[PDB]
Design a protein around this ligand. Structure first.
Ligand code: PAL
Ligand code: PAL
Ligand code: PAL
Lengths: 293, 293, 293
């Protein structure tokens, strides 16, 4: 594990080792590693609160120091390529890069980078640390994946979260289903597309997605009606009350309250939305350990 | 104390204890506390040099580590509420939030946050750390507040500094007076409005304010004449030369040289403007201690 | 050395002492100094990747802590002058300022700053840490400067790098030559202006410059042709193949690949472009040591 770029690059063995290490860091069963003397740069070319702040928390707790990089004050405005930016940070003594970039598969331009890269998101491609922390949360809830009924609702084709989660849940033997507006069906993902109300009473995990407005074109954005989306594709009171006693609600965040989820359900008893954000720190510690060990 | 949001929330006893702790940190009479292992996020949704950099100096000197948050690169652009931002930073393991936000009373939306909040400014509402460092500076100058004659000149109704200082000085038994253009009189603050030249010879403390151009409407901004404002409401040579031997000049900064104050008076003998910024570090150390103990 | 503002302020003795200290830090011959307990602010009012990130790497490796300052979130929008910003950071307990600013000779407004200032670039004026790391790289390559043939190609009159390097190379007894489009000839620098192809076979060092598009006026930017610039002023395959066995290629970065340099030459055997970026960390450690000693 030289890099962490895509869930398609991980075996189920590597997924279990990362999840179990993260759980043992969190429980105190395993003491945190010490990487005092090592440096990390966080390169966020798209916006982030959780992924950037939780990577920073993980890095500082493992004794790394950060090199500040804000895109808009960098020599990117002078015409510097992503490769030159990464190779520059290597040359000045960085031991690790964490990169979120708007280009799908940006990491294919970074073959000649000799320090580990953690992909914090490539456009609508992969979000492996979101997927791993989602899997960690499910594993802590139930202790197993095989036969789990998972419904992923919302903007599927524009979601790096849906893509990473589909591949890894399927490989772990979960039953993945999608609910989507017709416009946002992803043909590349072979799982059934269903009505929420046909399956809500027999699902174990409902994963809600934010609508990726900033990834959409003009026609989609001009015809968007929030109230109509909520009625057809959102978790409301009636749908929440049909969840089995054991079932949980997940969302990679941020939430648009009243759109994909009724506001007062965000911190309802079956929600693990804020739990996911806590777990992300421990999972990112496990990723850092695997890359720098 | 659990939070520091408003001077209306503090007793004069709490004000004295904060001022005295800050002075003892500054003098070396009291050793700095050690909060190694704790994390703070600085959330500045309005611009800042002093409040943000001095909070950062105070945090680092007490052994805290910071989680970087720039508003414009955060998931706020994806539609995340202030509450969700704060609860997210709590969930990932922040022990303290320092928040400046343009909404008056923003902190009333943060009742369900379980970690301490220091208000670095809520629009035109409160600026409690400015008020406390102003009070610390006055206390170090004179050793008492009762019967002090304080003139606060400039944009009163748009000033969180004037509002916080009015409440706390009045509670400590100071005589508070205002000089304002008619447009910027604050009706909510019961203190006399006076002409500078009627009281300048008998004041102990002149506090100058910056004009809050960024908080004004079109009509105010289109009619503004800097030279006319300076003649009527500014500290010039003639007004400075009428100050008593013991009197001091204060300004929360930044200064607009030639508007509320003649340029060469910013670092004149009776100015405590740069002294206030030094004292701000020690007062913010005292606040952090109270919030994290 | 109280400040580092201009190469015109340094003796050749001071240049040798800085270069040799930087080389001994890099080789491990000399242990890094420990400035734990000291604070630095990095004030980048123009964009930077190397100069800002390498100063930060140098600062953290010497045990300094940074006070975050981003121009666009500072009280500069409230009308604060550069002097007031610097004097504020002094007052709050900063021990060192690193400043990049668009105004040529900005530092002449900072006479009343009482802490050391390192100039990370003043408009088209001076870039002393670039020049010193360029000199360090040449010194490690050859062990001497006297009689060295150095060709500096590109936008000369808009380059703080060309200005700093001209003065210091000439003082060390190197033979400095320029290649420039007619528009970008600098009259203030008395060195021959030559065609690349007339001297390429006899030069020891080719230093390429980026075109300073952001420092240009309308007429220059509207008539720019990248293709034509590359043919006349760029390092291509034919020019690279004419270099002496011992000759090196330098560039302060970032590179515009295909303009001043053919893409596949950036990491060719004779290139020291990424070596320069590594050396900059050690040179900036030596500068910080000299200023805080
Ligand atoms: O799912 C979303 O809507 C955004 C999604 N979520 C995150 O990773 C959280 P954040 O943007 O705060 O780091 C992402 O793909 O970036
Ligand atoms: O009143 C002013 O001029 C600004 C005033 N002062 C400050 O706190 C200083 P700064 O904006 O640099 O943190 C404020 O209310 O933010
Ligand atoms: O030569 C250039 O193009 C810019 C030149 N280069 C640098 O110093 C490197 P950076 O801008 O990444 O700090 C400068 O003058 O800043």
């Amino acid at each position: 594990m030289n890099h962490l770029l895509s869930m398609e690059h991980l075996s189920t063995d590597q997924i279990y080792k990362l999840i179990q290490k993260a759980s043992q860091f969190k429980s105190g069963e395993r003491q945190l590693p010490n990487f005092e003397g090592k440096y990390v740069a966080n390169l966020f070319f798209e916006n982030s609160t959780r992924t950037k702040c939780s990577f920073e928390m993980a890095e500082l707790k493992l004794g790394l120091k950060t090199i500040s990089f804000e895109t808009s004050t960098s020599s990117v405005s002078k015409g510097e390529s992503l490769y030159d930016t990464c190779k520059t940070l290597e040359s000045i003594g960085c031991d690790l890069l964490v990169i979120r970039h708007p280009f799908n598969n940006y990491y294919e331009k970074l073959a000649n980078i000799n320090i580990p890269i953690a992909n914090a998101g490539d456009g609508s491609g992969q979000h492996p640390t979101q997927s791993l922390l989602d899997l960690m949360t499910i594993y802590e809830e139930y202790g197993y994946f095989e036969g789990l009924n998972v419904l992923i609702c919302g903007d599927i084709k524009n979601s790096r979260v849906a893509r990473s989660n589909y591949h890894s849940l399927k490989a772990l033997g979960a039953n993945v289903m999608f609910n989507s507006p017709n416009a946002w069906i992803d043909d590349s993902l072979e799982a059934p597309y269903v009505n929420i109300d046909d399956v809500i009473e027999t699902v174990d995990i409902v994963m809600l997605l934010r609508i990726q407005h900033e990834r959409h074109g003009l026609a989609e954005e001009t015809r968007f009606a929030a109230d109509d989306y909520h009625q057809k594709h959102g978790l409301n009171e009636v749908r929440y009350n049909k969840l089995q006693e054991h079932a949980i609600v997940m969302h990679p965040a941020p939430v648009n309250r009243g759109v994909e989820i009724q506001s007062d359900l965000v911190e309802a008893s079956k929600s693990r939305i804020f739990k996911q954000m806590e777990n992300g720190v421990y999972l990112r510690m496990a990723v850092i350990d695997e890359l720098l060990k």
